[PDB]
Every structure is written in C-alpha cells, then in structure tokens.
Design an enzyme around this catalytic site. Structure first.
Site, mmCIF file in Angstrom:
data_model
loop_
_atom_site.group_PDB
_atom_site.id
_atom_site.type_symbol
_atom_site.label_atom_id
_atom_site.label_comp_id
_atom_site.label_asym_id
_atom_site.label_seq_id
_atom_site.Cartn_x
_atom_site.Cartn_y
_atom_site.Cartn_z
ATOM 1 N N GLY A 157 5.593 21.326 40.861
ATOM 2 C CA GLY A 157 5.016 22.203 41.857
ATOM 3 C C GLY A 157 4.638 23.544 41.268
ATOM 4 O O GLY A 157 5.106 23.924 40.196
ATOM 5 N N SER A 158 3.788 24.267 41.985
ATOM 6 C CA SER A 158 3.170 25.467 41.456
ATOM 7 C C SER A 158 2.783 26.353 42.626
ATOM 8 O O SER A 158 2.177 25.878 43.587
ATOM 9 C CB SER A 158 1.932 25.074 40.649
ATOM 10 O OG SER A 158 1.126 26.193 40.345
ATOM 11 N N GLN A 178 2.399 30.902 43.978
ATOM 12 C CA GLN A 178 1.819 32.205 43.677
ATOM 13 C C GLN A 178 2.396 32.863 42.420
ATOM 14 O O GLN A 178 1.650 33.290 41.535
ATOM 15 C CB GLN A 178 1.973 33.136 44.881
ATOM 16 C CG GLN A 178 1.379 34.511 44.648
ATOM 17 C CD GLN A 178 0.968 35.201 45.930
ATOM 18 O OE1 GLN A 178 1.482 34.901 47.010
ATOM 19 N NE2 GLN A 178 0.025 36.129 45.818
ATOM 20 N N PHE A 179 3.720 32.954 42.335
ATOM 21 C CA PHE A 179 4.330 33.527 41.134
ATOM 22 C C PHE A 179 5.381 32.618 40.508
ATOM 23 O O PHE A 179 6.265 33.094 39.803
ATOM 24 C CB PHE A 179 4.940 34.901 41.412
ATOM 25 C CG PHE A 179 3.952 35.916 41.912
ATOM 26 C CD1 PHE A 179 2.852 36.278 41.144
ATOM 27 C CD2 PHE A 179 4.134 36.516 43.145
ATOM 28 C CE1 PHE A 179 1.939 37.214 41.611
ATOM 29 C CE2 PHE A 179 3.234 37.451 43.616
ATOM 30 C CZ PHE A 179 2.137 37.804 42.849
ATOM 31 N N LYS A 183 12.557 26.221 37.686
ATOM 32 C CA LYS A 183 11.602 27.064 38.404
ATOM 33 C C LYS A 183 11.426 28.355 37.617
ATOM 34 O O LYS A 183 12.359 29.160 37.511
ATOM 35 C CB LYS A 183 12.126 27.388 39.807
ATOM 36 C CG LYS A 183 11.222 28.300 40.637
ATOM 37 C CD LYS A 183 11.829 28.508 42.025
ATOM 38 C CE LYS A 183 11.017 29.471 42.890
ATOM 39 N NZ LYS A 183 11.670 29.624 44.238
ATOM 40 N N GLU A 214 7.523 15.870 48.446
ATOM 41 C CA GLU A 214 7.587 16.646 49.682
ATOM 42 C C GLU A 214 7.579 15.774 50.925
ATOM 43 O O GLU A 214 6.906 14.738 50.961
ATOM 44 C CB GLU A 214 6.382 17.583 49.784
ATOM 45 C CG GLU A 214 6.299 18.677 48.747
ATOM 46 C CD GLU A 214 5.042 19.498 48.930
ATOM 47 O OE1 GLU A 214 4.335 19.249 49.927
ATOM 48 O OE2 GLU A 214 4.757 20.378 48.090
ATOM 49 N N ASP A 225 11.427 30.218 55.721
ATOM 50 C CA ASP A 225 10.238 29.531 55.220
ATOM 51 C C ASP A 225 10.349 28.020 55.388
ATOM 52 O O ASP A 225 9.932 27.264 54.511
ATOM 53 C CB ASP A 225 10.013 29.898 53.741
ATOM 54 C CG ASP A 225 8.579 29.647 53.264
ATOM 55 O OD1 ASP A 225 7.644 29.595 54.097
ATOM 56 O OD2 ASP A 225 8.395 29.525 52.028
ATOM 57 N N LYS A 262 9.355 24.461 56.483
ATOM 58 C CA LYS A 262 8.095 23.734 56.676
ATOM 59 C C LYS A 262 8.174 22.445 55.863
ATOM 60 O O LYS A 262 8.999 22.342 54.955
ATOM 61 C CB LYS A 262 6.909 24.595 56.230
ATOM 62 C CG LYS A 262 7.013 25.102 54.806
ATOM 63 C CD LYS A 262 5.841 26.003 54.455
ATOM 64 C CE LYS A 262 5.937 26.482 53.015
ATOM 65 N NZ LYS A 262 4.752 27.324 52.640
ATOM 66 N N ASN A 298 8.653 22.383 52.132
ATOM 67 C CA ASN A 298 9.944 22.828 51.611
ATOM 68 C C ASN A 298 11.109 21.890 51.957
ATOM 69 O O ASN A 298 12.281 22.273 51.878
ATOM 70 C CB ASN A 298 10.234 24.271 52.058
ATOM 71 C CG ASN A 298 9.360 25.290 51.340
ATOM 72 O OD1 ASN A 298 8.804 25.002 50.277
ATOM 73 N ND2 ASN A 298 9.243 26.490 51.910
ATOM 74 N N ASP A 352 13.376 25.983 48.230
ATOM 75 C CA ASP A 352 12.587 27.222 48.251
ATOM 76 C C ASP A 352 13.235 28.349 49.061
ATOM 77 O O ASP A 352 12.867 28.626 50.218
ATOM 78 C CB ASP A 352 11.138 26.980 48.695
ATOM 79 C CG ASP A 352 10.230 28.175 48.416
ATOM 80 O OD1 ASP A 352 10.742 29.287 48.144
ATOM 81 O OD2 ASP A 352 8.997 28.004 48.471
ATOM 82 N N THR A 404 4.408 31.242 56.137
ATOM 83 C CA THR A 404 3.169 30.519 56.429
ATOM 84 C C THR A 404 2.838 30.563 57.922
ATOM 85 O O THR A 404 3.644 30.105 58.742
ATOM 86 C CB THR A 404 3.317 29.048 55.976
ATOM 87 O OG1 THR A 404 3.671 29.021 54.585
ATOM 88 C CG2 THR A 404 2.037 28.262 56.196
HETATM 89 O O1 LIG Z 1 11.873 24.978 44.728
HETATM 90 C C1 LIG Z 1 10.753 24.512 44.486
HETATM 91 C C2 LIG Z 1 10.558 23.200 44.054
HETATM 92 C C3 LIG Z 1 11.559 22.265 43.780
HETATM 93 C C4 LIG Z 1 12.818 22.636 43.310
HETATM 94 C C5 LIG Z 1 13.756 21.659 42.993
HETATM 95 C C6 LIG Z 1 13.428 20.315 43.126
HETATM 96 O O2 LIG Z 1 14.338 19.360 42.829
HETATM 97 C C7 LIG Z 1 12.167 19.938 43.584
HETATM 98 C C8 LIG Z 1 11.234 20.920 43.883
HETATM 99 C C9 LIG Z 1 9.260 22.782 43.784
HETATM 100 O O3 LIG Z 1 8.155 23.568 43.919
HETATM 101 C C10 LIG Z 1 8.339 24.866 44.312
HETATM 102 C C11 LIG Z 1 7.251 25.726 44.425
HETATM 103 C C12 LIG Z 1 7.434 27.045 44.826
HETATM 104 O O4 LIG Z 1 6.350 27.862 44.929
HETATM 105 C C13 LIG Z 1 8.712 27.521 45.112
HETATM 106 C C14 LIG Z 1 9.791 26.652 44.994
HETATM 107 O O5 LIG Z 1 11.067 27.041 45.264
HETATM 108 C C15 LIG Z 1 9.627 25.323 44.606
#
Ligand SMILES: O=c1c(-c2ccc(O)cc2)coc2cc(O)cc(O)c12
Length: 274
Positions: free
Chosen positions: A19-20, A22-23, A41, A99, A136, A138, A141, A158, A177
């Site tokens: 995942g990706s 803003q920061f 992360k 998700e 947050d 949704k 998350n 998140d 959101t």
């Molecule tokens: O926590 C996550 C995860 C996340 C964390 C742990 C996992 O096992 C799976 C996804 C994925 O994309 C994000 C993307 C975000 O912008 C912020 C986040 O906290 C996350």
C-alpha cells in the site's frame, strides 16, 4: 522518544508493496533472524519545522505510542520501530488478505455483513475501552487475514489519525475521508469516541447495499450531506434488508454525538446481540 537507528536493511528484507499513501508506503518484509514476516510502513519525516510535507514528529510519536498499547485479535500490532534521517519505519503485523474495500468490490448478506461487523465492533470495543478513538474507520482500513474463506477474519489498521481521549473529547481539527467522517468532524467541533460510531454506521450501510450513504459528486457536497444527515435507505438496495439492520444504522447515523449509539450500545443492539 527516539527509535532504533541501525539500518533496517541489516535486519529485514523487503518484498511486495502492500500500500501507498500521502506520506507513507508499506512493504512486505521478512526479519532475517527469525524468518518471520511483517509489513514495514515507511513514514516520511518533516524536513523543516514549518513544512507541510512529511509527517510531524509529534504526529508520528502519537501513532507509535498508541500502537504500542495495543494487543487484540482484531487490531494490527506493532513489532519494532526504526528511524533514519528521512523516515520512521514501523514494523507491523502482516495481514495478507487485502482490504475489506477490495473484497467488497467483488453487497453482502446480513449474515456476511454481521460476521465482519462483529469483528469490527470487537476491535473498536477494545480501542474505546482504552479511550482510543481511531478517527479513520473505513473499508480501506479493515484488512482480511485470508480472503479465500467463508468468514474472513479481520484486523483494523492505520492509526495515523488515532487519538487518546483522556478528557472525553479532543479539539484539534482531526479530519479523515469525507465519505466516512461524522458531522462533528465536518463542523470542526470537539471530537470523541462517538465519531467512530458514525463511521461504523456508514460502513454498515455500504456492507449491506454496495452504496455510500452521503457520497456526492464533489468533496464539498459529501461534507454538506454529512452535516445535514442527508441519507436515505434506497428501496432498490434495501428492499430485502431487515428493518432491524436499518434500525442499527439509523441509530448510528445521528448528528448529535450524545444521542448516537455507543460501542457498548451497538454490541447489545438486537441485530448484533446473540
Ligand atoms: O497500515 C497500513 C497498511 C498495512 C499495515 C499492516 C498490514 O499487515 C497490512 C497493511 C497498508 O497500507 C497503508 C497505507 C497507509 O497510507 C497507511 C497505513 O497505515 C497503511
């Protein structure tokens, strides 16, 4: 608080991106010493005090402090924290089933919805019991452990907006959101655990119908709809949904936070209660 400043690449190997945002970017990883797998992360730091780019140390430390408190089957856990000049790197529990948002893109029956919902409520009950507001909530998350089972287990992720609510409310312009935020967020009013319960109402509406209750054509329209509690149960979507399910939603999508069902109320509601 300072974090581990050894190179994370000395202890972990990274792989697939999960995942990706803003920061932040999240990468699957594997700890060299144990072979155990995690999600790393990478949170971009502020480079100057008055920059709007990157995340402030204060905000990063808040998320870490909250994550350190947490141990529950329905919430992500924190394993380690590293940092260098550019990033803070959270080594998080790996949840690999994708998700809830994407699982939905594949409407649920009330049983399927309540099976997810009960786990979500259990996770939020744990958090609210610790006076932690998520702020947050949704479908994006909510992560599944395994998407190819009849009743997927889930974990809340998140905690970037999460706050401790030691005084019953926080007054900070916390803002997520538009589709999912409660009217008090839209109106910049003091915020407490109640905002999460509104978000749960929105999530439940979506689970049952495949439709978003307040979504407009622009962000400003959505926010205006939220503040006015401009939603209805469209017969095309809800014709074979039980009146009790609608009642559950109706008691969450309530403008006055004081009149809104609490997490304990939601667990005792006849739609949920065993
Ligand atoms: O926590 C996550 C995860 C996340 C964390 C742990 C996992 O096992 C799976 C996804 C994925 O994309 C994000 C993307 C975000 O912008 C912020 C986040 O906290 C996350």
């Amino acid at each position: 608080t300072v974090f581990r400043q050894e190179n994370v690449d000395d202890y972990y190997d990274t792989g697939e991106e999960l995942g990706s945002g803003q920061f932040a970017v999240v990468k699957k990883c594997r700890e060299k010493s144990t072979g155990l797998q995690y999600a790393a992360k990478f949170i971009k730091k502020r480079r100057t005090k008055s920059s709007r780019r990157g995340v402030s140390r204060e905000d990063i430390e808040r998320e870490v402090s909250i994550l350190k408190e947490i141990q529950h089957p329905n919430v992500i856990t924190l394993h380690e924290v590293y940092e260098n000049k550019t990033d803070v790197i959270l080594i998080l529990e790996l949840v690999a089933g994708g998700e809830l948002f994407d699982f939905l893109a594949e409407s649920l029956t009330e049983e399927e919805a309540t099976e997810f919902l009960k786990q979500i409520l259990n996770g939020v009950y744990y958090l609210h019991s610790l006076q932690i507001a998520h702020f947050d909530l949704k479908p994006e998350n909510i992560m599944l452990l395994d998407r190819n089972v009849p009743k997927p287990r889930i974990k809340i992720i998140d905690f970037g907006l999460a706050h401790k609510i030691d005084f019953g409310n926080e007054f900070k312009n916390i803002f997520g959101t538009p589709e999912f935020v409660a009217p008090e967020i839209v109106n910049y009013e003091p915020l407490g655990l109640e905002a999460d319960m509104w978000s749960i109402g929105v999530i439940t509406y979506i689970l049952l119908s495949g439709a978003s209750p307040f979504l407009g054509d622009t962000k400003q329209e959505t926010l205006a709809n939220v503040s006015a509690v401009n939603y209805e149960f469209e017969d095309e979507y809800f014709s074979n949904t039980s009146a009790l399910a609608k009642d559950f939603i109706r008691r969450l999508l309530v403008k006055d936070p004081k009149k809104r069902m609490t997490i304990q109320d939601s667990l005792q509601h006849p739609w949920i209660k065993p």
